[PDB]
Every structure is written in C-alpha cells, then in structure tokens.
C-alpha cells in the first residue's frame, strides 16, 4: 500500500 | 557532507548468505525511507527494495522476495540487506540510496561464486628505448591472475591522475581476471618523478606498491 | 511490473549541440489522481547513479539548466541542450509510481569529437614474469576517436589468432577519447622460439597502419 514515492521528503536532498 | 558508507561485500558461495550494511551521516537518517538498488557487471540498474522510517513498511522486488530481508537500525543510522540462498544471478554491485534516489552509497560488489580467492601478480610495463622523439612516454603495471573482482589501482598514492588509464578487467580463459593500468606523460617530464602503482585486492589481503622504471 | 523502454546508444552528439533521450512506459505513470513519478538518472563510469530530473521535469540539486525533462503518461524525453564533455555516461529512465520501481536499460551518451589517431606503445614481458613460465605482451592504443580500431599481433610476421584479449575504456570525460589495450599471452617456451614481436594498428586517424615492435632480448 504505502510506497516511498509518496513520502513528503521522497525527492528532497538530504543535505 | 552526506555520507552513505557501505560494507559487507565480497565473495560468497552459491546457496550462502551475506549481510550488507549502509551507514549514514550528514542527515537525519531516521526521517527517510531507504532503498537498495543493484547493478550486475556491465548491466543496468535493478531495484531491490525500500524500507520506511519506522520499519512498518518494507517493499521488495519480486526477484528477491523470500530470500532477502531489508532492515534498519535508526540508533546506529544503518541500513541492512540480509541475503540468503544467493545465486550467480545475484552477483552485482549493491547500492544504498536515501528516499527515491536522492543520495547514493559508493556500492559494494557481491560475487556469488564457488571459486577460491586468488591474489594478483603485479608486473611492470615499460617499453624498449626509442630513437625517434614522440610526444608522450608510457609506463604501467599489469595486474594479472586474480579473483574475484575488484582490484583498485592508484599511482603515487593518488597524486598522479593526469594521463592515467586503468582498463576494465577481462576474464581470462583460466577463469581469473587481469587488467593493466597505464600512465602517459609528456616525454621530457619522464625523469622528473618516480612512478609507483599501488594495487589493492582486499579478498586476498593483497597490497602491492610496484616501482616502475623506464 | 511496468516495463521502461529506452535505446542503448544515443546518436553521437557534438559538443555544444543538443541531445535527446526518450523512454516509453508500458502503462501510465500517473499515480491514481496525482503526480507522475517518472525520473531520469545519470551514471558515470565507476560512479553510482545520480538523480537528474524527478517527477518528469524537476531538476534535482546541482543539476544545471541544460538538462530538462518533458512528457506525459507513457512517453518522456530528456533534453541535454548544450552538451559538455563531462556529460558523457549512461542515462536511465525510472518509474516509481508502483512497486517494484523499474528502470530502463540505460542510454549511453556518445560525444562526437574530431578524429584523433591513437598513440601506440608496445610493452615486452617483464623479466619478473618470464621467470614464471608465461609471457604477456601488451599493446596500448591511447586517446583515440572514433572507437573502432583494428589491432593485429605479428610474431616473426606471422599473424596471431586466439591468444590475445582486448579491453577498452569508456569515453573520457575530458577529451572524449577512448583507449584500448591488447594483451598477447604465450608460454615462455613459445615466447623464446621467436624474435620479433609487433602490434599493428589501423584506425581512421592514421593514413597508414602503425607498427610498434621489439626484438626479444634487445631490452
């Protein structure tokens, strides 16, 4: 059901 | 600086097990999903799976479901991949990544093979003397008869990079790998420094520094 | 699972000119009633991949304006507008709309540069190696373009077959050339039966083939 693409920070630079 | 430092790779026999680690710093690891991706030698990227921050969701590729287990330890900022029932088709460089590919580890090569580890022989490559001027002069090291990959080669401890070409290894008919690393320099500069190739093969506990004289 | 189809090699692109790489998905990448999770990644040799464009058209950190993305549904394109030598590498399309996330096979960007003839060198077997029963002779072709090159080994002018192997580097990120090694493997016994060892190289940048040779013992 849950996939990482839908996380708020999925495409945020961790730096 | 974000760092994702992987470890645990190397040679493993078919049917065996290996655990990879990916240690994170420079960001709040506990807030990110984490991802494994692999790449067989000379082939494309293949997704292995992902895990959410609290480990309540773990998604896997069909090719690994039931053989591989992803986990994490947020207290140690570390992601793990436990691989069981390994087969030759699992040979690959395994990468970890944050989120959906937003920062990557360096990769660690897992070789699934029944062959033994064998350390390389390191031989100098130096031409015969020349009597017509040429614009560059070449030297190198032949790194022959090792298993598994990888070997790493540097020159002068990584200070010499301009003019260096380290070739992709080839599999010889013996089943052992070989490669050469060469460096070419402007001819009149040849005698102004020394040339040492630093060869490291971790599986065989091999570290060689070979001085190459023209 | 969703299949992502892209071609393995781009047309050779000249420095400063644009390149376009396309990818098709086997089903729509629109997630339910929201975003399109289609991305482009760049991989240079020996390096991990790097996210370039995410969700069709968003540039990731440190990605300059010459990289842009477009498309919708099942067809997408990466444009590299004013290609630089450092842009050489392999470009992967990716979907993460549904698990398992999947990737295309990778499209290699090839840079078209002026013809460059190889510099050729021949390396005899080392005395160290000869003390062990095998002789390796190495021929180096350095910094040439295009990639196609013919290397022949002659031992006392007899063509050698089935006893050499070649390795070729990926296109260089600075000068856009290739380098190639050819390694001839002989027993020490066979090596001591002959005198003249030669590598002969044919390449578009050479009007006549180049031969580099040595005589066993002379060095």
Residue numbers in the entry:
A (entry chain C): 7 to 21
B (entry chain H): 1 to 214
C (entry chain L): 1 to 219
Paper text:
TLT-1 is a membrane-bound protein consisting of an extracellular N-terminal immunoglobulin variable (IgV) domain (amino acids 1–110) connected to a linker called the stalk peptide (amino acids 111–147), a transmembrane segment (amino acids 148–169) and a cytoplasmic domain (amino acids 170–296). The crystal structure of the anti-TLT-1 Fab in complex with the TLT-1 stalk peptide showed that this arm of HMB-001 recognizes a linear segment in the stalk region comprising amino acids from K118 to A131 (mature TLT-1 receptor numbering). Consequently, the binding epitope is distant from the N-terminal globular IgV domain and the transmembrane sequence of the TLT-1 receptor. The biology of TLT-1 involves its partial downregulation through proteolytic cleavage and shedding on the activated platelet. As the TLT-1 receptor is absent on the surface of resting platelets and is redistributed to the surface from α-granules upon platelet aggregation, HMB-001-mediated localization of FVIIa is strongly dependent on the activation status of platelets. Consistent with the two crystal structures and available functional data, the generated model supports the lack of interference of HMB-001 with the known functional properties of FVIIa and TLT-1.
Here we describe HMB-001, a bispecific antibody designed to bind and accumulate endogenous FVIIa and deliver it to sites of vascular injury by targeting it to the TREM (triggering receptor expressed on myeloid cells)-like transcript-1 (TLT-1) receptor that is selectively expressed on activated platelets.
